[PDB]
Ligand binder design. Structure first.
Ligand SMILES: [Mg+2]
Ligand SMILES: [Mg+2]
Ligand SMILES: [Mg+2]
Ligand SMILES: [Mg+2]
Ligand SMILES: [Mg+2]
Ligand SMILES: [Mg+2]
Ligand SMILES: [Mg+2]
Ligand SMILES: [Mg+2]
Ligand SMILES: [Mg+2]
Ligand SMILES: [Mg+2]
Ligand SMILES: [Mg+2]
Ligand SMILES: [Mg+2]
Ligand SMILES: [Mg+2]
Ligand SMILES: [Mg+2]
Ligand SMILES: [Mg+2]
Ligand SMILES: [Mg+2]
Ligand SMILES: [Mg+2]
Ligand SMILES: [Mg+2]
Ligand SMILES: [Mg+2]
Ligand SMILES: [Mg+2]
Ligand SMILES: [Mg+2]
Lengths: 141, 63, 80, 67, 55, 143, 206, 70, 60, 145
RNA sequence: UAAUUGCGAUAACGAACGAGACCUUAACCUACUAAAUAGUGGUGCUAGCAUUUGCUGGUUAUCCACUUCUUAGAGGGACUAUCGGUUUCAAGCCGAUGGAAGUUUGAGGCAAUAACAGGUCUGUGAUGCCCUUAGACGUUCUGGGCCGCACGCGCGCUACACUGACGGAGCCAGCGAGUCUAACCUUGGCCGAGAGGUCUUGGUAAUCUUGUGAAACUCCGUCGUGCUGGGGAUAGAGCAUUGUAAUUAUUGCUCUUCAACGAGGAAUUCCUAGUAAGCGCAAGUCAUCAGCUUGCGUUGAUUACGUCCCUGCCCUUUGUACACACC
């Protein structure tokens, strides 16, 4: 084949997966391009990495991403992560290191976790309340 | 309206039988060379700055 | 034809809970001082190479009001 | 609160008591040492232990430690 | 029967609504005994010979 | 360059295809439209009155373009929204099986979808065509 | 800024302002400074952001919630009173709208007005119910800077929503309006009235 | 029924001449000049775009925003 | 995993403690190509009190 | 949509179906202030009558008005379902009526009394001032009648 | 210290039960073993648009390959690490750095000795004693009743709207569960506005329902502050589903009727991070019925990170004529 790597990004249940092949600078998510996405208020969340590290950067690669699970926001943070980690995976193998450290350094400076996936997760409700911490309601008498 | 800037130094402890109140010593940096102890309402760490509204009256304990 | 039964005199009954439970049953039911019964069982168990053993008797015995005893020797752990 | 229990502290003592030539303010090697030199059932207790024998060790370099 | 039922006055919301409510509606739990829970009523007691042969 | 429909955002594609089929005439729009409701989890009929059949038709079309095969059941569940059961909690409920299945026929008798094997309905060869066609029409508005 | 285009193409003002300055929805982040001393540190601005939605972790350690971008600290607190718990996208939009309105009126970096509105409403001293034996009097207290920002936010948003309740003007207009009058406190604002009256009673026990 | 649900030739002309000086114009702003209920107000915002002084900064439902033309 | 969630109490008294049990089902399959002999030689033995072995065949 | 002009053509308030209707409110909704005409029914009828739903009750040519009154009291001929209607399959001639305006008052009374005259339990329960449809009357509805 | 958790002090030294360890789940592995019941790239065969190569799909085996994502085996990993402040430089504690992770890592499971006349003889073919035992307190069968309505109390649900209702349109989860001597979960096609009907069909299940296209939510419209289109109680009339039976209306749909409620006195509950709150879903129950429960995921805050003022308990000291122990 050609130069190409696969990476991912996860935020809660959602798991966004990237295939970053060598190519002519596209970036499509699930099936459509990246200049659509929606939530769209959020839109700039996922444009972000490409700005962070300069819009060029991608003209030697094509990027595909497919999100599954998690809700409308869960996915948009998940995807942007897999995009940035996908850049850094490529320059890990196919470019030099000092570029890969150049990239990682400007992601880690701005960062919404972006390279690292966030540990946060729903805590188990326990019997006695509608929630995890939440208790019910007592009245004594 | 003579405002008075004072740099907090050394967190000395909580007062008020409630507990909300905290005792600190300050340092106006509009000429240091002098220091004073105040009561804060909110959360405080060393190197904060308090708008003392009366440069000349300090408070001790709370019940 | 499609099923079969087998007897298998288990290896040392002294470390079978069930064996000793049914023992104490058939002890007291055969008329035996409660202390004698239990303390007996704990002695056969311990002697049978146990690390430790424990016996509770709850219930009402000759008196009207219900009491309950413990009867433990040696080592036990209780958690996890 | 990460106050280390006695079994952690006790085992740690005896390990330094008789294996100071060996062990060295690196949790990693003191870990592997413990596998060889000591019997422990769980991985966590093993770390928890080595982690403290490495503590004790790391400050003995600066004076004695009572016990 | 049903003919009796609607013909019958003394019945239906109108009336009840214009009747005073007893004060026992608003009574508490009555409780009766709990401050006596620990002193046996049997008046009998066991003994110590029957207890000691027992245990 | 070339184009898909994926190249085009949701709203702009459908208000285009809706505008198409009204501009068109070749429809089949049952006739109980305007007197009908679109779900039992709804309160008022569609406000687009004269139209909105073209809205669903276009919506339906684009959806079945996007995937393998999908039928009345799926489409009913998709278009279904929350229903206030009055003083009782909201529950999702499926929407009208007629509206859709008849949009599925009207769009078929017009040749955009074909009763696919495996199941349901799947984008016709000729829809691929026309859908990628007005899609570019929607991009050429911003050229 | 020198153009760049690859396959799937990226819009002009999008390409433009982005790789340049790290500015907001599209708003200048430089300039923008904290008119009252202290109050810096405990008001963000730089690091700069695109929109004020983030997977922050400001809560699991004590003071670090200061390190949240203040503008997001506005929208965060925008989302409440029961119904609107969560609904951050809702908030976000309102703020974007809001800034636009604030900006439209009287020029000025809108987030800079948010800077001037907030700085202007944090009460410099207050009171707590000291024991004093039953009839609990009122000891004045020079209050923390952090609490001074918090209170500012809480105040601003609240009396904005209160006005915004039951009437035509959208929550954004009133949020804008509050900040506007709060820019240099003009006594016609919920927060200033409530600020000063907290200082009214703070001074009135000394 | 407290006024502002219709057109009134005087109101039309009110809209034409009374809308400079609105540093901010919007649904709400239109009702606040003691006139137009929110519905016809929204219709006006549209037909002041047709060729009328207002400059369309920012977008949509609930929120509208315009300034004077330049 | 097969949960069963229950109040502990036989009756109704007391704070409403709940308690859930579970039974873990572990299934697994392995495909082989081997003549009649090895198959049956592999089915009769390799038996175990605890493991439900099942050997289906066929291209359908 | 349209910056409209309109001369004096429109009257605020207007009386039809023996009731009163405010003009400066949208006609779909305006029409609902007749007894027995819910929002849906209002809607379909105007949709039927070739009347503009964007209009107020105000404008509406006098011809257009009368048309509405026509359709409203004859739904079966002017092609409106049957399941769209309040009183279908009567209980005498079993026709499909859409009882309108000051009539629905009397028709509730008619039914209500039909039960009582028949001594049926739902009847009795009505006369006893309670709720019929089988809800618990212990805890709920208290202030009341 | 969360802890008789330790440090220290020290006529004590050194130990065990309990706490801890442990075990379960949620987190991290491009390391290891694999997978047509999970999935990726390439190639076939093939549709659309562009055509200069492109872009977006179709194709349970037309093949070759791989295991990043999914699955679950075995290992690994964290030990509050490195450094630095703080402190009897003790246990520790606080901050920064690194880290999947640094609140017992998060949440549970388990849990010593004791006490209570706590609750359960209405789960038990567990049981003593009492009562009854053929005009039965056994048992079945027919019908009503536990729902009965001047009212007092408690858990809830829906709301009082414009951070909204409605209407189009975008379109996104995770725990589950499903039919043999049977009628369970149901895709698809028709018919019906609807509720539903009818024909077929896959699934004893990572293989089918199901990507459970769930809901808040996001978009563009309509309405405009008017008890309004907020709200949907009460009620009439009709159509359907479960069931042998629906009247005192099991549930469902349609039209209509359109109440109180304009943020709630004194009081009082719950809660510290993926928590609160909002939001729906599956499972229990279940012929039929969820405004309940048990879990689950979605959206995602504000404010503490303190204290002993209130309440609750714990430990000492102290008093005692109490030991059936202040009932
Ligand atoms: Mg334990
Ligand atoms: Mg919808
Ligand atoms: Mg939906
Ligand atoms: Mg709600
Ligand atoms: Mg009406
Ligand atoms: Mg132990
Ligand atoms: Mg793997
Ligand atoms: Mg860090
Ligand atoms: Mg008792
Ligand atoms: Mg029992
Ligand atoms: Mg019995
Ligand atoms: Mg009952
Ligand atoms: Mg309760
Ligand atoms: Mg909506
Ligand atoms: Mg029909
Ligand atoms: Mg079959
Ligand atoms: Mg109304
Ligand atoms: Mg409503
Ligand atoms: Mg159920
Ligand atoms: Mg129940
Ligand atoms: Mg004594």
């Amino acid at each position: 084949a050609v130069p190409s790597v696969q990476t991912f990004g996860k935020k809660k249940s959602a798991t966004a997966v990237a295939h970053v092949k060598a190519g002519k600078g596209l970036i499509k998510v699930n099936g459509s391009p990246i200049t659509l996405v929606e939530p769209e208020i959020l839109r700039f969340k996922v444009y972000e990495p490409l700005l962070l590290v300069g819009l060029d950067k991608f003209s030697n690669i094509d990027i595909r991403v497919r999100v599954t699970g998690g809700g409308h926001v869960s996915q948009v943070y998940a995807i942007r992560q897999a995009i940035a980690k996908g850049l850094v995976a490529y320059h890990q193998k196919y470019v030099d290191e000092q570029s890969k450290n150049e990239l990682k350094k400007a992601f880690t400076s701005y960062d919404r976790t972006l390279l690292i996936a966030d540990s946060r997760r729903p805590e188990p409700k326990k019997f006695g309340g509608k929630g995890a911490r939440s208790r019910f309601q007592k009245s004594y008498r | 309206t003579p405002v008075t800037l004072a740099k907090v130094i050394k967190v000395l402890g909580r007062t008020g039988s409630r507990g909300g109140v905290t005792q600190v010593r300050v340092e106006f940096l509009e000429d240091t060379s002098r220091t004073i102890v105040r009561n804060v309402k909110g959360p405080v760490r060393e190197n904060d700055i308090l708008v003392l509204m009366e440069s000349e009256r300090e408070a001790r304990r709370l019940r | 034809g499609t099923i079969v039964l087998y007897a298998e005199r288990v290896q040392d009954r002294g470390l079978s809970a069930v064996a000793q439970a049914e023992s104490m049953k058939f002890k007291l039911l055969n008329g035996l001082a409660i202390r004698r019964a239990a303390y007996g069982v704990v002695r056969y168990v311990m002697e049978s190479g146990a690390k430790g053993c424990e016996v509770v008797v709850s219930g009402k015995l000759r008196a009207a009001r219900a009491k309950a005893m413990k009867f433990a020797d040696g080592f036990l752990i209780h958690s996890g | 609160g990460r106050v280390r229990t006695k079994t952690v502290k006790r085992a740690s003592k005896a390990l330094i008591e008789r294996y100071y030539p060996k062990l060295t303010l690196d949790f990693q090697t003191n870990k592997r040492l413990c596998d060889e030199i000591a019997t422990i059932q769980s991985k966590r207790l093993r770390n928890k232990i080595a982690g403290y024998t490495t503590h004790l060790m790391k400050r003995i370099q600066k004076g004695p430690v009572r016990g | 029967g049903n003919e009796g039922a609607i013909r019958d006055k003394t019945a239906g919301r109108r009336n009840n609504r214009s009747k005073d409510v007893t004060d026992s509606a608003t009574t508490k739990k009555s409780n009766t005994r709990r401050a006596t829970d620990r002193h046996s009523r049997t008046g009998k007691t066991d003994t110590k010979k029957k207890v000691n042969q027992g245990w | 360059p070339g184009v898909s429909v994926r190249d085009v955002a949701a709203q702009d594609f459908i208000n285009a295809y809706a505008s198409f089929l009204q501009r068109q005439g070749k429809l089949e729009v049952p006739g109980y439209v305007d007197i009908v409701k679109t779900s039992s989890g709804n309160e008022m009929p569609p406000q687009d009155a004269e139209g909105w059949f073209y809205k669903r038709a276009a919506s339906v079309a684009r959806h079945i373009y996007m995937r393998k095969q999908v039928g009345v059941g799926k489409l009913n569940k998709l278009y279904g929204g929350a229903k206030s059961r009055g003083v009782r909690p909201y529950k999702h409920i499926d929407a009208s099986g007629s509206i859709n299945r008849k949009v599925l026929q009207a769009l078929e008798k017009i040749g955009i979808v074909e009763i696919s094997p495996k199941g349901g309905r799947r984008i016709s060869e000729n829809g691929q065509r026309d859908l990628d066609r007005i899609a570019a029409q929607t991009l050429e508005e911003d050229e | 800024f020198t153009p760049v285009v690859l396959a799937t193409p990226i819009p002009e003002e999008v390409q433009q302002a982005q790789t340049e300055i790290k500015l907001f929805n599209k708003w200048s982040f430089e300039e923008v400074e904290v008119k009252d001393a202290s109050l810096v540190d405990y008001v963000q601005v730089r690091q700069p952001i695109f929109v004020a939605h983030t997977a922050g972790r400001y809560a699991n350690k004590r003071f670090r919630k200061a390190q949240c971008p203040i503008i997001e600290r506005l929208t965060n607190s925008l989302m409440m009173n029961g119904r609107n718990n969560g609904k951050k996208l809702k908030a976000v939009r309102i703020i974007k709208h809001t800034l636009d309105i604030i900006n439209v009126l009287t020029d000025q970096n809108p987030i800079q007005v948010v800077v001037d509105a907030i700085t202007n409403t944090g009460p410099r001293e207050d009171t707590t119910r000291v024991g004093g034996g039953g009839a609990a009097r009122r000891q004045a207290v020079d209050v923390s800077p952090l609490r001074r920002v918090n209170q500012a936010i809480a105040l601003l948003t609240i009396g904005a929503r209160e006005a915004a309740f039951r009437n035509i003007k959208t929550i954004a207009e009133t949020l804008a309006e509050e900040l506007i009058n709060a820019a240099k406190g003009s006594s016609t604002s919920y927060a200033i009235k409530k600020k000063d009256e907290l200082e009214r009673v703070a001074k009135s026990n000394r | 029924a407290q006024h502002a649900v219709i057109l009134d030739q005087e109101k039309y002309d009110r809209i034409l001449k009374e809308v400079p000086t609105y540093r901010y114009v919007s649904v709400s702003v239109l009702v606040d000049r003691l006139k137009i209920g929110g519905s016809l107000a929204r219709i006006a915002l549209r037909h002041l775009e047709k060729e009328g002084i207002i400059k369309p900064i920012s977008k949509h439902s609930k929120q509208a925003i315009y300034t004077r033309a330049t | 995993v097969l949960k069963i969630s229950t109040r502990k109490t036989p009756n109704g008294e007391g704070s409403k403690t709940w308690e859930t049990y579970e039974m873990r089902i572990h299934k697994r399959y392995i495909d082989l190509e081997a003549p009649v002999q090895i198959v049956k030689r592999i089915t009769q033995i390799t038996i175990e009190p605890g493991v439900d072995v099942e050997v289906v065949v066929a291209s359908n | 949509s349209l910056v409209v002009q309109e001369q004096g053509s429109f009257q605020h308030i207007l009386r039809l179906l023996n009731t009163n209707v405010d003009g400066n409110i949208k006609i779909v909704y305006a029409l609902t202030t007749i007894k027995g005409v819910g929002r849906r029914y209002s809607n379909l009828v105007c949709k039927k009558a070739d009347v503009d739903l964007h209009k107020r009750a105000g404008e509406l040519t006098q011809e257009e008005l009368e048309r509405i009154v026509q359709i409203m009291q004859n739904p079966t001929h002017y092609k409106i379902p049957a399941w769209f209607l309040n009183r279908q399959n009567d209980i005498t001639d079993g026709k499909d009526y859409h009882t309108l305006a000051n009539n629905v008052e009397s028709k509730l009374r008619d039914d209500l009394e039909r039960l009582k005259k028949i001594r049926a339990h739902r009847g009795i329960r009505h006369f006893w001032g309670l709720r019929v449809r089988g809800q618990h009357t212990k805890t709920t509805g208290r202030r009341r009648a």
